[PDB]
Design a protein around this ligand. Structure first.
Ligand code: CL
Lengths: 240, 243
C-alpha cells in the first residue's frame, strides 16, 4: 500500500486580520508557524520519511514545508513548487475584510461565494489594490492569458489542480515514492475529492484541519483503503 | 551579459567546535544563520532577482539558501539540491578536532591535506564514528559504490562537481536564467577555478568569504568580463575577506 501525506498550512498574517487571502502571498503568523512545528514533531515521532515534496508558490505554504522538513530532518528532500497548488483566487474580494464584506453584501451573499462549488467571487479589476501585486508578478510570468485567474470558484481551483496531480504527482506515487504535499485548503480539497470521490456538497462541508499531518494509505489504484488519518497527541487528533 | 551569484555558507556548529565537517551534516550556528540573513539583505538592497537555485544536500548550505530566499522574498523560486555541490569529504578526519589533529600529526602534515590540491585525507574506515551516519544515509542511496567517497582531495571534489555544473547549471545560464548557487568552500572553488581558469596553486590560495554574495558577470562563452565582486557594507566585505 502507498502512503501519502497532506498538510494544510496554518494561520496566516491576513487570517488574524480576517481578510480574504486567495493569491495574496500572506506569510504565516507566529501561531501558524508554531502550528507547523508541532505538526512536524508529530511526523518525526511517528517516524515518517519521504522521498519528494510538492508545494505551491505561496510563502505560507512553502514556509510550512520548510518548517516540517527541518523538524523531520529531511531538508535534503527534492522539492517541487507549482502555482497549481495555490490557494483559490478570491478575485476582487482579495484584501477585503470578511466581516465588513458580510455587513455590506449580506451574510447570505458572502456565505455563497465562500461555500459554493461553482460561484466565482467577483473578478479582480485592474484598479484593485492588489491587481499588479498579483497579476503582474514574475511568479506567473509563464502563465497564459487565461490560466492567470481574475477570480476562482472551488471548481475552478480543482480544474487547474488535478492536471498537476495526475501528470506530476501520481507518477511519483506509482513509482513508490513517499510523497508529501504542503498546500492550501481549497487546493487540497481537490485532491481529497478526487481520492474519496466526494460529491460537490461533500467537499463544501469538509474543513481540513491546519498544521496537522493528514495521512492516506492508497491501494494499487491510488484509492484510499481507509478514511484519512491524523497525527499527533489524542488531545489534538481528538479535536479533529 | 549573464549574471551568476554564489554564496558560501557561514559558521556551522562544528566550526565553533573547531572540528572537521566534510560530509557530516552540521547545521549553521546562530552567527552562521545571521550571516546569511545579512547577505540576503545585501541582495535585497541591490535589487537582485533570480530564476532558479542550486544547492547541496547539507543543512548548513540549504538553510543558507532558505534564509536568503526569505530575505529577498523569493521563496517561490525553483530549487535544485545535489550531492555534487557538497563540501569536500574529509575522510577519516571527519569529526576530529583540527587542533588535536595538528598536535598529533604536526602542523606541516595538517597544512598539507587542507591546502593541497591533489592529496586526499585518510579514508573513512568502516570503524569511523560517523562512517554509518554518513555512508549509510538515505541521502546517498542512489550513488554507485564508486561515487560515494570515503575521502576527497580538492581535485576529487571538483571532478564530481563540474559534471553537474556543465550538465545542469550551464544550460540554465545559457537559457538566460539568473542562477543562485548556495554551497561550500571546496565545491564553489571548483566553479571559480573553471570560470577564471586558475592554476592548482592559485586555487589553493583562494579563500571565499562567507555569507557574502559573490557576483559574476559572464559573456556568451560563460567567461567572466570582470573580476568577482562582493556585496555588502565596505566594512562587512573587508571583515569577511579576512577569514
Ligand atoms: Cl526548497
Amino acid at each position: 500500500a502507498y502512503k501519502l501525506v497532506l498538510i494544510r498550512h496554518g494561520e496566516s498574517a491576513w487570517n488574524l486580520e480576517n481578510r480574504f487571502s486567495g493569491w495574496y502571498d500572506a506569510d504565516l503568523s507566529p501561531a501558524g508557524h508554531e502550528e507547523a512545528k508541532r505538526g512536524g514533531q508529530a511526523l518525526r515521532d511517528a517516524g515518517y520519511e519521504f522521498d519528494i515534496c510538492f508545494t505551491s508558490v505561496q510563502k505560507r505554504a512553502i514556509r510550512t514545508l520548510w518548517t516540517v522538513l527541518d523538524a523531520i530532518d529531511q531538508m535534503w528532500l527534492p522539492v517541487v513548487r507549482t502555482w497549481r497548488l495555490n490557494e483559490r483566487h478570491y478575485g476582487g474580494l482579495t484584501g477585503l475584510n470578511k466581516a465588513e464584506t458580510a455587513a455590506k453584501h449580506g451574510e447570505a451573499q458572502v456565505k455563497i461565494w465562500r461555500r459554493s462549488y461553482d460561484v466565482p467571487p467577483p473578478p479582480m479589476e485592474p484598479d484593485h489594490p492588489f491587481y499588479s501585486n498579483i497579476s503582474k508578478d514574475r511568479r506567473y510570468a509563464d502563465l497564459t492569458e487565461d490560466q492567470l485567474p481574475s477570480c476562482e470558484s472551488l471548481k475552478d481551483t480543482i480544474a487547474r489542480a488535478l492536471p498537476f496531480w495526475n501528470e506530476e504527482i501520481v507518477p511519483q506515487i506509482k513509482e513508490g515514492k513517499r510523497v508529501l504535499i504542503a498546500a492550501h485548503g481549497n487546493s487540497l480539497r481537490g485532491i481529497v475529492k478526487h481520492l474519496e470521490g466526494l460529491s460537490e456538497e461533500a467537499i463544501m462541508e469538509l474543513n481540513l484541519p491546519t498544521g496537522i499531518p493528514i495521512v492516506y494509505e492508497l491501494d494499487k489504484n491510488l484509492k484510499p483503503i481507509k478514511p484519512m488519518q491524523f497525527l499527533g497527541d489524542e488531545e489534538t487528533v481528538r479535536k479533529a
